[PDB]
């Protein structure tokens, strides 16, 4: 097999990591296990520490707020790798044992057990003017040589890898999403009925999404247009409970329905990133470096879990909107509209490999 390795610029400290995508099962997260090779002749008395930080840069990196830091560190774990097993004995995964066999006796393990409820690696699209660190939560494993934990770590003898925390589509699809509404205007005492439903609940990136629209217009009003929009909600919890809807795919069909009539149809639309390039703030799936990645996958957060800690929670909704006429015997050019929303999941299937930005 292959193990990734990074080296400190000074070259006296190297970090070996088994993989850079750590799948997040809802109950528990895969441990971040790895090895660090040090130079005892160089670290005569200083210790070698390792940390796993979960940075979050919702604030504009290119800008700054006076007297305040828009950044945040949801999770920060520490471990005293060198000297070895200072606190207590810990089991070594087979990968760690293999690395220790391959590397000399100067290689020492490190392992992190991430708490279950934490954000997934997501980044927001920066647009054609911004630069620097990409906005959005992301994880990092940083190993350094310090005499004390709080002492400043010289950047010339510390090495940082960027890891990813990803979730894969649930194995058992849930109930098919469906929705229905019945509006009643002030013109006729009859209900305009709308009913929409998707083919399935879990969709894989690039797979087309099918909406089975069914309208019954018993009222004396005519519907002009029908708009189907797959839109993305990004619940951010940096300072507030914000919401950022952003239509990632749209289709506007001029299929009218006469009064006291019916209309059943199937609209197929596929959300992809080719035409969503300019939409700043769109949440992408997360990248190790500057590269290309699909639209951010949904988040399978546990039901009833506190939302305070969560950094970014992504979800998707297909919105069906009927642009019903508002014309009458005497009035303006108004045209009301009824709407319905269908939640679905947009994730990857559980793979045997997932190269981030090959």
């Amino acid at each position, epitope marked *: 097999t*292959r193990v990734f390795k990074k080296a400190s610029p000074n070259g006296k400290l190297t970090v070996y990591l088994g993989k850079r995508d750590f799948v997040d099962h809802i109950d528990l997260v895969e441990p971040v296990d790895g090895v660090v090779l040090v130079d005892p002749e160089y670290l005569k008395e200083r210790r070698v520490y390792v940390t796993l930080t979960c940075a979050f840069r919702y604030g504009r990196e290119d800008l700054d707020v006076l007297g305040l830091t828009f950044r945040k560190d949801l999770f920060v774990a520490n471990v005293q790798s060198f000297p070895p097993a200072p606190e207590d004995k810990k089991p070594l995964t087979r990968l760690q044992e293999r690395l220790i066999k391959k590397l000399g006796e100067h290689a020492y393990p490190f392992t992190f057990e991430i708490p279950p409820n934490l954000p997934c690696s997501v980044t927001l699209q920066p647009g054609p003017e911004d630069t620097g660190k990409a906005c959005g939560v992301d994880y990092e494993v940083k190993a350094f040589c310090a005499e004390n934990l709080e002492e400043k770590i010289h950047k010339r003898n510390s090495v940082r890898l960027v890891i990813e925390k990803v979730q894969y589509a649930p194995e058992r699809p849930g109930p098919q999403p469906t929705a229905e509404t019945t509006r009643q205007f002030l013109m006729s005492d009859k209900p305009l009925h709308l009913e929409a439903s998707l083919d399935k609940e879990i969709y*894989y*990136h*690039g*797979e*087309p999404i099918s909406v089975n629209v069914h309208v019954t217009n018993n009222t004396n009003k005519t519907v002009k247009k029908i708009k189907i929009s797959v839109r993305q909600y990004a619940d951010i919890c940096l300072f507030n409970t914000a919401q950022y809807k952003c239509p990632v795919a749209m289709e506007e069909a001029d299929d009218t329905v006469a009064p006291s009539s019916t209309f059943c149809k199937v609209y197929t639309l*596929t959300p*992809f*990133l*080719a*035409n969503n390039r300019e939409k700043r703030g769109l949440a992408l799936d997360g990248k190790l470096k500057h590269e*290309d990645t*699909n639209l951010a996958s949904s988040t399978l957060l546990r039901e009833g879990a506190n939302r305070e800690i969560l950094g970014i929670i992504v979800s998707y909704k297909v919105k069906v909107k009927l642009v019903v006429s508002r014309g009458g015997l005497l009035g303006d050019l108004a045209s009301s509209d009824v709407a319905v929303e269908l939640p679905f999941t947009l994730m*990857h299937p559980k*793979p*045997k*490999e*997932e*190269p981030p930005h*090959r």
Partner: antibody
Amino acid sequence: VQLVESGGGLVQPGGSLRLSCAASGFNVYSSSIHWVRQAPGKGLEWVASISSYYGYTYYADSVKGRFTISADTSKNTAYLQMNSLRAEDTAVYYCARSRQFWYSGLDYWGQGTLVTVSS
Amino acid sequence: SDIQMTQSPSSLSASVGDRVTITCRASQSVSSAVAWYQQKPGKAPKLLIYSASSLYSGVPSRFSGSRSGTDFTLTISSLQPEDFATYYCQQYKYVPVTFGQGTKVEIKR
């Protein structure tokens, strides 16, 4: 799951031609479409590629400008528009598909259409 | 970058049941992103192994792929009379994708 290529035939040198690869069971957004040409008695050579999910389009350095690759997602079809054909473009052109997300080799191939550019 | 892959040998004579090995050397380093195709005369290629170690779903277990440094090897442990074709080698890490010269497996007589 059957990509089928068509539109290949004899063309005078410097002429035009259009190869159409119709994919059945593939979503042009979850798959990337490549055109690979094999000369008579020679190894395979990659000639073009299109990935619609990102809109990316790549060509081999030997067919820059002359060849244009497009995709009609409505018909789930890919087109190679070959203009100004030199005598070195005679070959069997096969259309292949690859998993769009995390490319894992050219899964499925077309049956290949001959293209004979001779005066 | 334009990476040139050299597949050797360019010919082979082997009898049924023998072990056949074909090697592929890449100019630069390709991180396990190599695939092995198999084109019989007339027909179109067919993926056999991807990532230099995996087997495509539907391939006989005799075919095996291995990597060492920048040298990849495809091994048919027990050659069968249906395994005598031309086997190629692709390196799909850097655009443009490059194929090997093609190794042709004959039948010993």
